[PDB]
Design a protein around this nucleic acid. Structure first.
Ligand SMILES: Cc1cc2nc3c(=O)[nH]c(=O)nc-3n(C[C@H](O)[C@H](O)[C@H](O)COP(=O)(O)OP(=O)(O)OC[C@H]3O[C@@H](n4cnc5c(N)ncnc54)[C@H](O)[C@@H]3O)c2cc1C
Ligand SMILES: [Zn+2]
Ligand SMILES: [Zn+2]
Ligand SMILES: [Zn+2]
Lengths: 104, 737, 80, 97, 26, 12, 99, 99, 79, 113, 98
DNA sequence: ATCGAGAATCCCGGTGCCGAGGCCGCTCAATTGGTCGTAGACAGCTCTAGCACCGCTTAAACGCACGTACGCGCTGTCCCCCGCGTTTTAACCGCCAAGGGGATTACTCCCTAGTCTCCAGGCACGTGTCAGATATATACATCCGAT
DNA sequence: ATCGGATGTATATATCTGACACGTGCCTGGAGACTAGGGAGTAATCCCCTTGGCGGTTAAAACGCGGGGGACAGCGCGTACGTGCGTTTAAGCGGTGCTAGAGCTGTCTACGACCAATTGAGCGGCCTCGGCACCGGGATTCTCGAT
């Protein structure tokens, strides 16, 4: 039968991209399965936090604003992406507390 | 090394270095290579290297210049260019009348206009007796320029500040360089829409290439000199611009400056003849003539002393040409006729408005006279009988529709020939009815009346009911660049300009021409009383209507082609009324606007005082002016002046219904229609006609009989300006012969 | 003329407003045009170096996303 | 007449994981290309770390274990744990078939 | 002609506007 | 382009 | 009747809520485009740009300037000042190592 | 007649010495026990080459030294001449250290 | 005693005076131990993984120079 | 039938003092490109010879100017950190036994008369 | 004691040779020699990697001297780029003339 | 305001000793010399996408007044940290012991490049909606006087 | 310290319109079934280099004790910049035109791996002494407390 993969993410396309970037001279069998699994994990929770933080804007289409604060709200995704600008992202609403106008 | 020059055909049998920049300069001796700038100017390979080589002392100076020349120009910074621009010694001509020798200035001296203006030989024995450098004569050999490597680039041109948008070296100026009447804009700016009487700084005009073919390959030198000349004229238009005045402002290094000075006179006279400079009301007398004695032997009879006749007469006279003007009436001016009897104000019975002051000859002449014009404001309320100012939304709605009608007309005409022409009025009507049919929209009576105002305004413009004017050609002239900028009221009146043009000319009044015979050696002109005049050439500037009436007998007769053109145009007409009052009764409602509109009660009455003009921009005096156009011109032909005045006052009391209106204390009503030697206001294209008609009427006959007048100016029909320019045009044609 | 000046004083105000800056002093704008000028000089220099190497007269967007990646300022949303 | 080349992406796959997580909720195109260059960025970080890590042990082969170590150097902490745990789930779930 | 109009100029029916594009321009 | 030409310099 | 006005800081702080809240590009595209071309003429002449590359340099401009006002603002707040001054810009540039 | 120079002569003179010298400051056995103690958490029963302990010593002193450079510029930018812990927190935040 | 204090108070004084620091406040030392602890936790957390990948039980110098290089803090003089 | 033919090396074929063969092998054996061109490590060995000559030159000038006859890594510290551009290439690089080039802020210097 | 060791490499005699070229009568210490060794390796993988992805962008599969010229014009700051390119072209051409 | 203890710092001189430098064998990686498919310079088209231009509306930029509040210098007041003697105390150093683990060399063998064909997965390409911007009208949330 | 204009901002509702989720077709890269040399797991050993302990000295650390100067709160006074309104003004738009160059595809060719014998060249072992420490003594300079 043709059904052989039946998993997730293109093992063959990623496998090509490991073989055709001159990383090693040769690439083992299990490795693109592994890297594809890791990238499906990362992709999954980043789209999940864009999912809840997309529903908080009451929309159905995730725009890059939702990827902006969806990344920058969790600590670990921010630390993975702390040197990366996102186009059409903007900022989180950070306000320094001395700028908050106080009074009676 | 050698003693010979690189350039093939160079007659320099003894090259010497002008630079002497290198401590190693070859001077008059041997060098590996002599670099050629002109037949009389070279620099040795040592001085070349002095700037060109990185390890030489003059390299800094050459790289810095090479940088300025980059942030500023479009030509490649070559060492030869650097030399011609930076190191070549200046030359200046001795001003002592009986000397006039050209002298080389020492290499450290920087020639200025002040130095050139007063220079004499020796200015740091009889210095004037020392022989002229033999190289100077060479410059006036036609092949001299041909062996010039690079074209001259002027320094600190008076034209420079007007051309900051162009690459200096594209308009004959040097990249390494650096309160005029706002109406003087002689040069097109990059990416500009067309406007009248503009020239490209970087391109020669057709007539220019015609006169100076030797510049078709490289127009650099010409453009620099022409641009300088125009800049100088507009900088001071109150004096004749002479070669003497130009020369000091020609600053460029090298022997080429001599060639530039030699060319300026040729270009000056061409510019003068064509009417670009030394024109307007500038007056010049015996021993001040603006063109060489070579043009003087000839004679001319000018028929008509309106703006066209007087323009040509002024031009020809200033040129040194013998001119006699024959005028039918007991006064000059023609359709310029001002009433100076009104209290504190001048009111034109004829022309008084200037349509587009930018580059307008009229604006120039006001400058020359120290006259100020009043720029019209935009506001013109549409006031109804009786009292109501038209709602701004109704106003905008009908303006939009009116102009939309014009759009579709302009669309309809695209594929129609003269043989399929229909009247503008009829076309607009049909398109209007067919629109109300198409779209169920229905306009109120007022909305219809407002549309009538706009129609009336077209009729005023054409001097005709719209059912006479060509749908195809009514606005033909706008194919050509028109006069941009302010429309103004010539408050002192056109008569001041007229007087000034005519002053000191040979003008015969009460001399109506009846016969023109150009079958013999020279033109025989005979007046209605049998008085004989003769000259080599004749210019006719009589109004279109008079040509149509055939009041002048031509022998041989005008061509059938000319007659068809003459009859294809309409002798348009309007009349004016002026009214003086005890006080400014309209100030409350009108609020300082220059004019106010009058909404027509009906289509038939639409041209009866459609616009009222406040004739005192200072808002002190109380004179109103209004116009009679279209159908209403006819309705008034059997009414006496008092009756016309009555209808105008009745109109005003309607327009100002909710207030009182004082009686007028002085007035006039014009009757141009029945002035025998005029019989019109201004031309227009009749149905079936073409703009080309203006050209055909303009065409001289056998270089012997010439035509001018507003009805001969295709670019600028109808106007005093257009008539004036047609006279300048013909003066140029006549003077060329 | 003076392209640099084209960075308006309200635009520098607006970027400060996105940054969370309340009040802006006097000579902030001169130094702001200077800093932006330096940063665009480096990024454009490296982008031109990326574009002359392919011997192409036209600078693309992948050029400058690469040039921003190499300076440690990676920017998604234009590919690569 | 003649058509034009192409150039792959991850957009169908990103769309599929989006259908796994919140299935009735769509995605816009700028965010799709941002996710695309995101997964190319992480792909080159992890493949690059596999190169620098294989280039130390005198080895010229990238098996899955090097990707396990390199993920345990890039990703910080918790998502490193679940990332590597899903990796063992996919190696073992692969080879047990 | 339209050019005779000062007050309340008409605007409709005009041909497209031409714009000089010279190379001598900086 | 006839439109732009200077009136006094196109009389050929 | 004529006061209405606001404090110097209400328009500021509400303006911070708006311009932190929105996302769009806010230096004008033709002056920025001419700026990138004029800086680009120095290294090599007679250039051509894709439009989205000018968008990309616009993103680097907003990211680098905006982040520089983040750190400059924390610098001046750490002086017990609520107003940034050019020495604070100079401080955050030296701390990031930009000299 | 006992008389100490002042608060600043020992400081600035001793800054001239400890800027001028080259060697490694914090002592070998307490630092070595520190690296082994932090090392026990991720894995039990490790072993170290001695030069690697010198390497962690060198990078650790250079990172702390650069941190005092920058927090010194921080507190001088407050018109103070004394390091206080919120300045340390600033430079760790300005630089990007503050996770 | 100082489980981790090792970096005595005068030792932090000596590093600060190499940095060009005149006067040191009181709570600087405990925070300095904290910052040094965080830096070493990251550096040898990353270094021990390099020692684990070769399945070796001894951390070497190439280990920590490589793990310092990866964090953008490259240190010559060991390899 | 001979493989001699003036058995020469290279560095002298280019006039340098860097190993073209060793650098060349190191370009082929790090998986940087499947093919490696003809004269690439000639060019790259030239660049590294210039850089080596610059740093050792400035450590030589500083080596006399702090009165030794032998380059120690301290002279590499203040040798590198005094040129601007060599510092900008090496701004993220600590070098061991380097210490700090003597910098003193202006407010620390005494406020004497 | 009596057993084969393990062949090793370095750059140290070459750095010593350039030291003989610049200041010919001047010594160098051992840890400084290992500093220069790790410096040459560090720069070597910098421009080697820049040649890798700079050659990867243009859909090539070959590292030639134009690529190293570009990559040196990316890492070397300015005045340091220019004389590196002049020595580089001098070594390419000076090689090629034989 | 300007001048002496005196203490830290810099200037020669023998010593030593050991780490910098050099010399002698010597394995092996450079070298030289041919092939060879192929990556890539090179030519030419194409068409498309960047550049140029012109008119209209107008949001945005510009510029004047104004006021208050933010910066900043002076003043006092406290205390925390700097400086220096005194104890101690644990780091440094030399040497001695033991083996666990790194490096080496070999052994065996599974495994991942390499080939050729086979097919459907994704990817180019029309397409037509339902999600969102845009008015558009409408009732809260908090600001700012003025009380 | 409360109350009210007011006012910017949150809350339904239509509405066009178009960007995205989707269906049709295709073609080529994923894959599937083999082979083969080699990279690497795996064993065993060599020894060495890390760890451990123990005693002897002691530079450094700890700690107590002056004391003063540096942080910091108040506070007054200037100025500069935020706010808002009239003026302009060129940026955006939006269409129109022109062609320069990205990109495609094909042509032909000079060039890098494959082996494969040949060799000196850099490297390790192994000396050997001169430059840096390094006390050791001694005049200079700078600081700090006096006039
Ligand atoms: C009421 C009115 C309002 C106008 N409004 C304006 C305006 O606002 N702005 C504007 O620019 N223009 C206006 N014009 C038009 C302008 O006046 C004319 O276009 C211009 O005067 C025509 O110039 P002309 O030289 O060609 O002819 P004319 O002015 O017509 O003069 C022709 C001369 O020829 C003479 N003549 C005729 N026959 C003979 C003969 N047989 N022998 C000798 N001489 C003869 C006539 O007497 C007259 O002197 C207006 C005209 C009128 C009448
Ligand atoms: Zn000379
Ligand atoms: Zn000659
Ligand atoms: Zn003379």
């Amino acid at each position: 039968r043709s059904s052989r993969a039946g998993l997730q993410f293109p093992v063959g396309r990623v496998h090509r991209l490991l073989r055709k970037g001159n990383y090693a001279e040769r690439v083992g069998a299990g490795a693109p399965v592994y890297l594809a699994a890791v990238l499906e994990y990362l992709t999954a929770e980043i789209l999940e936090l864009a999912g809840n933080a997309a529903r908080d804007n009451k929309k159905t289409r995730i725009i890059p604003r939702h990827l902006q604060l969806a990344v920058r709200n969790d600590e670990e995704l921010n630390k993975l992406l702390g040197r990366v600008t996102i186009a059409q992202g903007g900022v989180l609403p950070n306000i320094q507390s001395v700028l908050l106008p106080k009074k009676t | 090394g050698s003693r010979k020059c690189e350039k093939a055909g160079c007659t320099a049998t003894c090259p010497v270095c002008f630079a002497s920049a290198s401590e190693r300069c070859a001077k008059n001796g041997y060098t590996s290579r002599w670099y050629h700038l002109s037949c009389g100017e070279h620099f040795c390979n040592e001085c070349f290297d002095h700037y060109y080589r990185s390890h030489k002392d003059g390299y800094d100076k050459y790289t810095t210049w090479k940088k300025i020349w980059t942030s500023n120009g479009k030509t490649e910074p070559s060492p030869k260019a650097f030399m011609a621009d930076q190191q070549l010694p200046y030359w200046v001509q001795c001003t002592k009348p009986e000397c006039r020798k050209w002298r080389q200035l020492t290499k450290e001296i920087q020639l200025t206009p002040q130095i050139a203006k007063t220079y004499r030989c020796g200015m740091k024995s009889d210095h004037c007796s020392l022989p002229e450098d033999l190289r100077v004569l060479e410059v006036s050999n036609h092949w001299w320029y041909s062996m010039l490597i690079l074209p001259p680039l002027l320094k600190d041109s008076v034209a420079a500040p007007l051309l900051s948008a162009y690459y200096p070296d594209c308009v004959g100026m040097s990249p390494s360089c650096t309160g005029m009447n706002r109406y003087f804009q002689p040069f097109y700016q990059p990416n500009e829409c067309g406007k009248a009487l503009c020239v490209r700084p970087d391109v020669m005009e057709l007539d220019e290439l015609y006169e100076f073919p030797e510049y078709s390959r490289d127009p650099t030198m010409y453009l620099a000199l022409r641009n300088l000349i125009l800049a100088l004229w507009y900088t001071n238009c109150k004096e004749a611009l002479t070669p003497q005045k130009c020369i000091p402002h020609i600053i460029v290094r090298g022997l080429v400056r001599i060639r530039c000075v030699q060319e300026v006179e040729r270009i000056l006279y061409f510019m003068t003849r064509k009417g670009l400079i030394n024109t307007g009301v500038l007056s010049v007398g015996a021993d001040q003539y603006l063109l060489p004695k070579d043009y003087h032997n000839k004679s001319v009879i000018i028929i008509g002393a309106g703006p066209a006749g007087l323009a040509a007469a002024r031009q020809l006279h200033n040129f040194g040409i013998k001119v006699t003007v024959l005028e039918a009436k007991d006064r000059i001016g023609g359709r310029v006729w001002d009433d100076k009897s009104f209290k504190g104000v001048t009111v034109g019975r004829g022309a008084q408005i200037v349509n587009g002051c930018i580059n307008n000859p009229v604006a120039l002449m006001c400058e020359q006279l120290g006259i100020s014009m009043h720029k019209f404001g935009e506001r013109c309320d549409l006031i109804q009988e009786g009292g109501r100012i038209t709602d701004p939304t109704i106003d905008k709605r009908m303006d939009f529709h009116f102009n939309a009608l014009l759009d579709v007309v302009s669309e309809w005409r695209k594929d129609k020939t003269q043989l399929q022409d229909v009247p503008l009025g009829e076309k607009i009507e049909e398109i209007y009815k067919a629109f109300i049919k198409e779209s169920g929209i229905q306009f109120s009576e007022l909305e219809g009346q407002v549309l009538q105002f706009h129609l009336s305004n077209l009729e005023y413009a054409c001097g005709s009911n719209l059912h006479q004017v060509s749908a195809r050609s009514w606005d033909h002239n706008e194919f050509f660049a028109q006069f941009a900028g302010d429309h103004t009221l010539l408050t002192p009146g056109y008569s001041v300009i007229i007087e000034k043009l005519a002053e000191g000319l040979d003008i015969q009044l009460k001399s109506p021409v009846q016969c023109i015979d150009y079958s013999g050696d020279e033109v025989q002109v005979t007046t209605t009383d049998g008085t004989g005049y003769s000259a080599q050439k004749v210019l006719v500037t009589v109004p279109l209507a008079l040509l149509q009436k055939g009041a002048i007998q031509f022998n041989p007769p005008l061509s059938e082609k000319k007659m068809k053109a003459i009859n294809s145009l309409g002798a348009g007409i309007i009349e004016k009324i002026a009214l003086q009052f005890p006080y400014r009764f309209w100030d409350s409602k009108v609020q300082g606007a220059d004019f106010f509109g009058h909404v027509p009660p009906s289509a038939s009455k639409r041209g009866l005082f459609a616009v009222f003009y406040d004739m005192d921009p200072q808002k002190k005096h109380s004179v109103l002016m209004s116009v009679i156009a279209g159908e209403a011109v006819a309705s008034v032909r059997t009414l006496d002046d008092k009756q016309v005045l009555q209808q105008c006052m009745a109109t005003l009391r309607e327009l100002f219904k909710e207030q009182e209106v004082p009686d007028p204390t002085k007035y006039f009503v014009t009757r141009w229609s029945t002035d025998p030697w005029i019989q019109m206001a201004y031309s227009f294209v009749k149905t079936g006609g073409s703009g080309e008609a203006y050209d055909i009427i303009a065409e001289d006959i056998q270089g012997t009989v010439f035509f001018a007048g507003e009805a001969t100016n295709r670019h600028f029909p109808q106007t005093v300006t257009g008539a004036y320019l047609s006279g300048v045009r013909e003066a140029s044609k006549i003077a060329a012969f | 003329r003076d392209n640099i000046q084209g960075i308006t004083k309200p635009a520098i105000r607006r970027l400060a407003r996105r940054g969370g800056v309340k009040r802006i002093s006097g000579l902030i704008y001169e130094e702001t045009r200077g800093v932006l000028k330096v940063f665009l000089e480096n990024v454009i220099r490296d982008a031109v170096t990326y574009t002359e190497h392919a011997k192409r007269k036209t600078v693309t967007a992948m050029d400058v996303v690469y040039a921003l990646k190499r300076q440690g300022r990676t920017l998604y949303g234009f590919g690569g | 007449k003649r058509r034009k080349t192409r150039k792959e992406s991850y957009a169908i796959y990103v769309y599929k994981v989006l259908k796994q997580v919140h299935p009735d909720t769509g995605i816009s195109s700028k965010a799709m290309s941002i996710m695309n260059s995101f997964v190319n960025d992480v792909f080159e970080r992890i493949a690059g770390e596999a190169s620098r890590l294989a280039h130390y042990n005198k080895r010229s082969t990238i098996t899955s274990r090097e990707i396990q170590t390199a993920v345990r150097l890039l990703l910080p902490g918790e998502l490193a744990k679940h990332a590597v745990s899903e990796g063992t789930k996919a190696v073992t779930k692969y080879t047990s078939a | 002609a339209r050019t005779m109009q000062t007050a309340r100029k008409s605007t409709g029916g005009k041909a497209p506007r031409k714009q000089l594009a010279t190379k001598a321009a900086r | 382009d006839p439109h732009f030409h200077h009136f006094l310099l196109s009389q050929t | 009747k004529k006061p209405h006005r606001y404090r110097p800081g209400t328009v500021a702080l509400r303006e911070i809520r708006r311009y932190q809240k929105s996302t769009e590009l806010l230096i004008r595209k033709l002056p920025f485009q001419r700026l990138v071309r004029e800086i680009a003429q120095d290294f090599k002449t007679d250039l051509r740009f894709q439009s989205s590359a000018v968008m990309a340099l616009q993103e680097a401009s907003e990211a680098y300037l905006v982040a520089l006002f983040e750190d400059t603002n924390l610098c001046a707040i750490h002086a017990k000042r609520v107003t940034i001054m050019p020495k604070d810009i100079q401080l955050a540039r030296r701390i990031r190592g930009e000299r």
